[PDB]
């Protein structure tokens, strides 16, 4: 059985997610339009920048995240942002289409679209294999939200100072996830480990994305298409 405090963490994490993920995607029409040279860089840059703002909002509602120092909050966000985005993107991913479908056909992104934004198959191949395998996990909403929160509260990121506090936050969330799966997820004896595995894949996806981001950011004709928030969060400055 789950404790009162464990389920509260669940509630406040589900709420935080529902506040920061708009299943209507009606905000996308505000981005620079897609073009299908790097024709998709403007739109996808806006897609990513928008998503960073959502991830910061989710983070701010994780229990304890706001009590960290701002430095740790920034450190945790600069290192984990691209991972939370890949995780949260599973909600629009479709096995049918092997793509991310966000309402209309102009907001459907396949692999070929993402290449027109400066990323290669050495990133897109493992990413799409990650998305299908994660989609197959058939995660409950409670589990999806816990994994995002656990990924964000990882103490083994470059730059975190108060390691001990962050590890403890993350430990609590894991205990909540282990208990939740046990009590509430039938046939989920091996699910916790499969989820922890996905965190490991995320780190490899992160590295590859960072590699390719650098070549984008070192070319001013491309980096100028990015947003101020993207350049700051993915930039290599330290506090």
């Amino acid at each position: 059985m789950l404790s009162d405090e464990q389920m509260q963490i669940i509630n406040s994490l589900v709420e935080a997610h529902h506040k920061t993920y708009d299943d209507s995607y009606s905000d996308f029409v505000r981005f620079r339009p897609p073009v299908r040279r790097l024709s998709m860089l403007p739109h996808l840059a806006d897609l990513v920048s928008y998503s960073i703002q959502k991830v910061i909002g989710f983070a701010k509602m994780i229990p304890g995240f706001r009590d960290l120092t701002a430095e740790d909050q920034i450190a945790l966000l600069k290192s984990s942002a691209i991972e939370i985005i890949m995780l949260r993107s599973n909600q629009s991913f479709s096995l049918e289409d092997m793509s991310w479908s966000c309402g209309g056909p102009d907001f459907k992104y396949c692999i070929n679209d993402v290449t027109k934004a400066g990323h290669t198959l050495e990133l897109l191949e493992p990413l799409v294999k990650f998305q299908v395998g994660l989609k197959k996990l058939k995660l409950h909403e409670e589990e999806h939200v816990l994994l995002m929160a656990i990924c964000l509260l990882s103490p083994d990121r470059p730059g975190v100072q108060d390691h001990v506090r962050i590890e403890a936050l993350q430990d609590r969330l894991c205990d909540v996830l282990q208990a939740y799966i046990r009590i509430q997820h039938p046939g989920g004896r091996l699910l916790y480990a499969k989820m922890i595995q996905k965190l490991a894949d995320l780190r490899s996806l992160n590295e590859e994305h960072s590699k390719q981001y650098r070549s984008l950011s070192f070319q001013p004709e491309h980096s100028m298409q990015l947003t101020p928030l993207v350049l700051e969060v993915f930039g290599s400055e330290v506090s």
């Binding site: 703002q53 910061i56 701010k60 701002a70 909050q73 920034i74 966000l77 600069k78 101020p228 928030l229 700051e232 969060v233 400055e237 330290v238 506090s239």
Partner: peptide
């Protein structure tokens, strides 16, 4: 050093 981030974090 992280202007926008600090603002976004209230």
């Amino acid at each position: 050093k992280h202007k926008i981030l600090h603002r976004l974090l209230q």
